[PDB]
Amino acid sequence: DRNRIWIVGTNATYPPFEYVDAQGEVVGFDIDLAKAISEKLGKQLEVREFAFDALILNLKKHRIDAILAGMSITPSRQKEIALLPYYGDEVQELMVVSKRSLETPVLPLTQHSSVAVQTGTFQEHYLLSQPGICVRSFDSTLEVIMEVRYGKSPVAVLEPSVGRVVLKDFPNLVATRLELPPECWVLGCGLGVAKDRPEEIQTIQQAITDLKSEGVIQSLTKKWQLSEVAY
């Protein structure tokens, strides 16, 4: 045949957006969204995996065509690439996760031997910018959680959207809110596209809007337990 390929770069360590499930398959909200957008584009989807901190550079170098990796729209990133919003609202707080049996009070974070967090993320960067916080940085959300569940780190930091979904499975852990200062606020998730392609940006933009017109993204949010009036 004639098979026009569309390559989406991701980092499948990030449930419920992209992760490896009980069966060893790469699944999630961003993967279903990629499939739905690829149908609108008239293209066959190919998913490729990179380190989360290498997605932007690979996008810019044209090793991939788009990024779908639950990537927060931030001012810093918008200077480098185009981010087309598709899920979520402004983020003004992080979730601190601890065992319910934890004796020391969760806050302040400076008190603990270490705080576990996912690498390359805006929450890691926030933590690292604060004096007195000893940060341990991990590849995946599961690793971050397992570190707390087995007593190796007394606390972890997740984003509120991930925290709400994944802690449904860990009833012995509790969430505590940490407000961010306004300069550290970020927006929702963006589909990354190379910035100097005003054309390709318009077509994916249109694809996103069309799927929302059709109720498709809303149905995927419910499927992946992301539909979230709660903030």
Ligand SMILES: NC(=[NH2+])NCCC[C@H](N)C(=O)O
């Ligand atoms: N697929 C991933 N590893 N995603 C990490 C995203 C974390 C956070 N939303 C950020 O944009 O920094």
